[PDB]
Amino acid sequence: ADWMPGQPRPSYLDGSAPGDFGFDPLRLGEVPENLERFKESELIHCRWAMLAVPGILVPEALGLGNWVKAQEWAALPGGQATYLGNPVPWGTLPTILVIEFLSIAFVEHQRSMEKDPEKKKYPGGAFDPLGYSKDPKKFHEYKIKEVKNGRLALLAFVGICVQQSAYPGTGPLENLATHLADPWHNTIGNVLIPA
Amino acid sequence: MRDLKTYLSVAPVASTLWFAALAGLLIEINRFFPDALTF
Amino acid sequence: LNPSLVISLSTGLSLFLGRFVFFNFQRENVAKQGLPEQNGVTHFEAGDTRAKEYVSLLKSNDPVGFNIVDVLAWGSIGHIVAYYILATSSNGYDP
Amino acid sequence: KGEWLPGLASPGYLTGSLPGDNGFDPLGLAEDPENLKWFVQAELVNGRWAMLGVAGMLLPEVFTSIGIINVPKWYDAGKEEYFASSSTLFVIEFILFHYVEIRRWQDIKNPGSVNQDPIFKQYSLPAGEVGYPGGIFNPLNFAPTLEAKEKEIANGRLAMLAFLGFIIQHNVTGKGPFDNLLQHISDPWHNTIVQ
Amino acid sequence: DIAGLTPCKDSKQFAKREKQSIKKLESSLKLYAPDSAPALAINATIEKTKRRFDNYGKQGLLCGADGLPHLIVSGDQRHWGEFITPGILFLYIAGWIGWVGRSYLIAIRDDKKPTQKEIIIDVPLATRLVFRGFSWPIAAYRELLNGELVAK
Ligand code: CLA
Ligand SMILES: CC(/C=C/C=C(C)/C=C/[C@@]12O[C@]1(C)C[C@@H](O)CC2(C)C)=C\C=C\C=C(C)\C=C\C=C(C)\C=C\[C@@]12O[C@]1(C)C[C@@H](O)CC2(C)C
Ligand SMILES: CC(/C=C/C=C(C)/C=C/[C@@]12O[C@]1(C)C[C@@H](O)CC2(C)C)=C\C=C\C=C(C)\C=C\C=C(C)\C=C\[C@@]12O[C@]1(C)C[C@@H](O)CC2(C)C
Ligand SMILES: CC1=C[C@H](O)CC(C)(C)[C@H]1/C=C/C(C)=C/C=C/C(C)=C/C=C/C=C(C)/C=C/C=C(C)/C=C/C1=C(C)C[C@H](O)CC1(C)C
Ligand SMILES: CC1=C(/C=C/C(C)=C/C=C/C(C)=C/C=C/C=C(C)/C=C/C=C(C)/C=C/C2=C(C)CCCC2(C)C)C(C)(C)CCC1
């Protein structure tokens, strides 16, 4: 097993699946049909966090709004969503709320009707315009690069969420700023060890 | 004598001796360290 | 908020969803777990004469078979979503 | 091999094979061979840390008393101010030990399975006994002889006893270990468990 | 403080209770000559009463409106002496008794007439097993890990 040298890997994880480093200490994927669903579910999680982590960091580096401040314009009656400074001419709460439900539910239900298991996770066609999946050897290389970047993104999202939990209101980049103030005092040590 | 040592090992006899010893021990701990509510 | 606009937009979308986007899935699942059975046999087949499926109502000349029960079902969800939006906007709740 | 109690039948699982066998397991803690295997490693690691700590506790106090250095007493050194917060120190101590001890662990579970560098994969420990990694951990290439292992274990057992003494002696006398010794040398027959 | 209580060392009803208790014993004390055996005995109870109340105050016990100590067993670290600590001691001793008890039934289970060592204790055998209890957590965990503790 690569994920923990000297540890025997589960017998159903042989390293062929992209990102199969033999990690499954609870043996969740011992039921083969669950393993395949879990493969699909992991990629879906990976691709969302890979979109979100830029979305959480890029606007904080730029104009006002850490990923939590970008959401406090709703809730309280009023509604004045601003994209890149300009208040978008439709950024009221019920407008995007319906648009989000209708658009996301439609494309998510469409995803669920695919019967083929390999197209459930690697559909291709329109979503592979540049033909990156044409080469079978190169196809599998990008499969691993996808899952590894996606697991890193999921890991970053957890940090973002857990950091927010510890320093409410702050943003992840402000956390890094506060860290670089004096790294030997502004650490997770304060969180793990109060005062 | 070996018959007597067998009898002294019978369930009731071994029990009183065991529990007598136990009671003496607990009584003396309570005479030396009385009124212990914590620990 | 215009009530007629909210109600008829909600019902419109719900009816649209049930006819064009969710129809196959709902039909597939009804076929999957079909009529209720007692001891391996439908209630009607067991003698519950009052348990006869009303094929007359279920008939429809709609291309996909969207019938009057579908209109009642998806039309009900629309009215429920509509009146949730209307009542929720009628108050001045602050979280 | 040795007898901790002349004329007393050694436990039969203590066969003269392990360095430090003096027949001492009167409570039978180690009759199961897998307990014995684990307790051997546990004695090595407790004895090695005791030797480092007891040296770090006693010897600095001796050199302050002489006057060549001036360092806090061991039970005061936590109070001092250091370039980094003590909670910061703990987090890095946890992370570094977590890596290093899981690695020691793997080799107990699966001897040899973790002797090679995972990053610079051309470097490796040579094959050896568990609890005695050698190679770069023995840069002066001392022969890990039976005598050396027996001296290692004797010194570890003595330091473990001494550490036990430092702890009990401090919570009884308030002072430090070299202080208790100097006070005892003064007039021994009156300062000897009269506290 | 915890659960609206106050430390017994600050509690007025706690102090009242000690006072009413000593006054009770002194009403009996005044019956007897000061050298007499009853006077010494009642005085011994009085000193023990005084030791007890100061001891509960110094151990950090919380008191209620009743003036009596109330134990905090939630896990709170100021009150481990009220449950966690004597409880660990109980489990250590209880497991010792049970592990020794099982050692004896196992030791005699393959004997000729096993019920004979159940009504007539083989005391020599028992003196040899009595100290297996010292390490029951390690021994019981070890029999688990290698299929020896539970039958299939
Ligand atoms: C070797 C001794 C021994 C051991 C290890 C156990 C172990 C167990 N018993 Mg059992 N039990 C025993 C003796 C023992 N019992 C005796 C003598 C009786 C008759 C009173 C019972 C009656 C009994 C009942 C009614 C129940 C249990 C239950 C249980 C289980 C849960 C714990 C419990 O409720 O304790 C309870 C313990 C008792 C009620 C009394 C036993 C305490 C005695 C004093 C210990 C044995 C002393 C023995 C003489 C030692 C001699 C050894 C010496 C020669 C070296 C656990 C498997 C419960 C269960 O099945 O849960 C799943 C349950 O419902 N037991
Ligand atoms: C990390 C988490 C998954 C972690 C699960 C792992 C650890 C499970 C590990 C194990 O199971 C294995 C593998 C094997 C078992 O044997 C053992 C265990 C240990 C059980 C998924 C998070 C998944 C997180 C993803 C899905 C979140 C996507 C969020 C996006 C939509 C956010 C968008 C926005 O953030 C922007 C962009 C801007 C903001 O202003 C507004 C909002 C809307 C907030
Ligand atoms: C780990 C070791 C101590 C290491 C301590 C070091 C790191 C201290 C580091 C620091 O000091 C510095 C340098 C600087 C200070 O400012 C701070 C601290 C942080 C304090 C003690 C182990 C101490 C180990 C103890 C003493 C082990 C004793 C167990 C023995 C007695 C068992 C005997 C028997 O078990 C047998 C063998 C078999 C059975 O049959 C019979 C019985 C009788 C049960
Ligand atoms: C491996 C390696 C490899 C390479 O190659 C080579 C080399 C380098 C050689 C190596 C290294 C090694 C080293 C590290 C060693 C260390 C050791 C020490 C630490 C010991 C201590 C050791 C320790 C010791 C014993 C301890 C002892 C102690 C004592 C008894 C004490 C006593 C005391 C008491 C109690 C108390 C009082 O009051 C005081 C006193 C009196 C004082
Ligand atoms: C033929 C045709 C057509 C037509 C159709 C239409 C136009 C439809 C309509 C329909 C509709 C329009 C429907 C409706 C429905 C409705 C319903 C079905 C409702 C329900 C309701 C409910 C259920 C309610 C409830 C409630 C109440 C009562 C109170 C309050 C609360 C609530 C809300 C819950 C078209 C042109 C398209 C196409 C071609 C063909």
Curated annotation (Swiss-Prot), chain D:
Gene: lhcA-P4
Record-listed chlorophyll a 4 binding positions: 155
UniProt subcellular location: Plastid, Chloroplast thylakoid membrane
Residues noted as binding chlorophyll b 4 in the record, renumbered to the chain: 104
Chain segments annotated as transmembrane: 49-69, 82-102
Complex and partners: The LHC complex consists of chlorophyll a-b binding proteins.
Positions of chlorophyll a 3 binding: 152
Annotated cofactor note: Binds at least 14 chlorophylls (8 Chl-a and 6 Chl-b) and carotenoids such as lutein and neoxanthin.
GO terms (BP aspect): photosynthesis, light harvesting
Family: Belongs to the light-harvesting chlorophyll a/b-binding (LHC) protein family.
Binding positions (chlorophyll b 3): 85, 101
Binding positions for chlorophyll a 5 per the UniProt entry: 151, 169
Entry note about domains: The N-terminus of the protein extends into the stroma where it is involved with adhesion of granal membranes and post-translational modifications; both are believed to mediate the distribution of excitation energy between photosystems I and II.
Keywords for the protein's UniProt record, in alphabetical order: Chlorophyll, Chloroplast, Chromophore, Magnesium, Membrane, Metal-binding, Phosphoprotein, Photosynthesis, Photosystem I, Photosystem II, Plastid, Thylakoid, Transit peptide, Transmembrane, Transmembrane helix
Major localization listed first in the record, in broad terms: plastid
Binding sites annotated in the UniProt record for chlorophyll a 1: 24, 43, 157
Membrane topology: Multi-pass membrane protein
Posttranslational modification: Photoregulated by reversible phosphorylation of its threonine residues.
This protein's GO CC annotations: chloroplast thylakoid membrane; photosystem I; photosystem II
Species assigned in the record: Pisum sativum (Garden pea)
Residues where chlorophyll b 1 binds: 4
Reported induction: Down-regulated by UV-B.
Protein name according to UniProt: Chlorophyll a-b binding protein P4, chloroplastic
Any one GO molecular function term: chlorophyll binding
